[PDB]
Design a protein around this nucleic acid. Structure first.
Length: 129
DNA sequence: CCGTTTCCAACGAAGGCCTCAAAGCGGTCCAAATATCCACT
């Protein structure tokens, strides 16, 4: 049905941005529409959470695109700890802006109890302090 | 024997603290402009 389209969308997210074909930007916008729809009806799995978080916090698609990826982040399943560790490392890199950092922190505060393990999160107390 | 310096008894206000009542609105919830901004071209 559309799950193959979702896999193609996350693969295209893995490729990177585009320079000349700005209509392919509207195609990936349709892809984001599909991701939002599937996240609203049933959510997202745990395998793409790490990839989408790393792509959003890497800073390759611009702020206007990364602003809605965090909004459409709906953890239908449990969240892994290595994904949060990689997200904290990408925040410590410093390529992000202020709005995306605020959004990520609000999302982590809202989705705190949806994480399975919390000992490696406490093991990163200094980076948060 | 008498005037003068000095310690002692004493009224006071003086300050410091406590309590109550009354006038005020800052804080909380909430509207719809609107203006900060980030990169749009």
């Amino acid at each position: 049905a559309e799950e193959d389209a979702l896999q193609m969308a996350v693969g295209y997210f893995e490729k990177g941005p585009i320079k000349a074909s700005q209509n392919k930007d509207k195609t990936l916008e349709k892809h984001l529409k599909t991701v939002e729809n599937v996240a609203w009806k049933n959510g997202l799995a745990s395998e793409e959470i790490d990839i989408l978080l790393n792509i959003a916090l890497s800073g390759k698609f611009g702020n206007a695109v990364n602003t809605r990826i965090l909004k459409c982040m709906i953890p239908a399943t449990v969240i892994s700890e290595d994904s949060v560790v990689k997200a904290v490392s990408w925040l410590c890199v410093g390529k992000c802006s202020g709005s995306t950092k605020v959004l990520f922190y609000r999302w982590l505060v809202a989705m705190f109890d949806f994480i399975d393990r919390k000992e490696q999160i406490n093991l990163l107390y200094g980076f948060f302090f």
